[PDB]
Structure 1
Amino acid sequence: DVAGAVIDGAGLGFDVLKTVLEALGNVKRKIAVGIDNESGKTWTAMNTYFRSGTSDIVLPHKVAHGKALLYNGQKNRGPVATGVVGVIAYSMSDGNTLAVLFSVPYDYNWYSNWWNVRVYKGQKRADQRMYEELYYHRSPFRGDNGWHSRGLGYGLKSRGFMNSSGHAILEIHVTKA
């Protein structure tokens, strides 16, 4: 149950994400991401785009139906007052893209955690334009310690949760609508 592995879907929960957080160690901002695939079809990694921060982790390459992927990121190291903000992209078996946004800021006096999920038509790599779409235009969910559910179209829906603090967990389930 490490970032970069897939686990039986049922196994994904807050604790496994906490384990992922902890293995990152003493850094100011960071995220553990778990996405559970009940789409009915296989996901293959495309790429992650970072607006800010990094990960030393290779996105799990294949995520079969019934598996969950484990991933992480963290702020750029050293004296930069910045967080960890990015977009993950997976290609699905139907030829479309599953896109996930995470945003953990540095300054909670002025900013909050956000996340989002959307299915794009075709093969689309994560990039800055996708960032701006998911963040400014496609109604992102606040990391407000609450669950949020939404239809993805394409026969699918999303359910996920993200906390509100600088050590973020983000738990997403993709299921048949």
Structure 2
Amino acid sequence: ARIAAGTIIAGAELTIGLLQNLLDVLANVNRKCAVGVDNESGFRWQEGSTYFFSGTADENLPYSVSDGYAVLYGPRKTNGPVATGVVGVLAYYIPSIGKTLAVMWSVPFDYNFYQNWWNAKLYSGNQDADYDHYVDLYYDANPFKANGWHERSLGSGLKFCGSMSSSGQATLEIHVLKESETCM
């Protein structure tokens, strides 16, 4: 079908129900996240990269996300009784503002101690997604719980809003827009 992870769609198509469909076509493992990031920024995103602290994805992250488009991505845990979740970062270079957008997800194995988290941030230059982004976004830069919609300014005239669902098979919906536009 036209639902497929590791692809680009018109940004206006992105909703939670679309991401739930995506979840259903990902591998049938018990920790996974259907990620959708809508580029309403007015700027081209390119050189997509990924970093996994744990887990993997079966489809590669698209190279670019033009203005007006959303990217779909499907991180999931390693298969089996391995007591692991899926935790990582995707990043895009935004050349017209000289910044890198990074997006973090964390879907833990052990909900007896942990919970879902997500975050997004701009960094300067063209930074390949890496562990230092994960640590900043998860431990230092005030990530969001799976408790509804949230909005935060990014600088460079941009902001983001988004929402993550709370269980081990999760959706993560994020929209990146100009500061003057309304998401909340």
TM-score greater than 0.5 by the shorter chain: yes
- Match of residue 136, structure 1, among 131, 139, 153: 139
Deviation at residue 106 of structure 1 after TM alignment? 0.7
| Structure with higher strand content | 1
Give the CA RMSD over aligned residues: 1.0
1:112-153 Cα distance to aligned partner (Å, 9 max, x none): 000000010111111111111111111001122x00000001
CA distance in 1, matches of 2:140, 2:154: 15
The unaligned stretches of length 5 or more in structure 1 are: none
Percent identity of equivalent pairs: 55
Secondary structure of 2:21's counterpart equals: helix
CA distance in 1, matches of 2:6, 2:128: 19
1:121 corresponds to:
124
C-alpha contact 2:48 2:64 (8 A) present in aligned 1: no
C-alpha contact 2:27 2:76 (8 A) present in aligned 1: no
CA distance in 1, matches of 2:132, 2:92: 16
C-alpha contact 1:159 1:173 (8 A) present in aligned 2: yes
1:17 corresponds to:
19
1:60 corresponds to:
62
Q: How many residues align?
A: 176
Deviation at residue 166 of structure 1 after TM alignment? 0.2
Deviation at residue 16 of structure 1 after TM alignment? 1.2
Structure 2 residue 62 is matched with structure 1 residue 48: no
Letter in 2 for 1:35: V
The unaligned stretches of length 5 or more in structure 2 are: 180-184
Letter in 2 for 1:108: Y
CA distance in 2, matches of 1:168, 1:89: 20
CA distance in 2, matches of 1:7, 1:131: 26
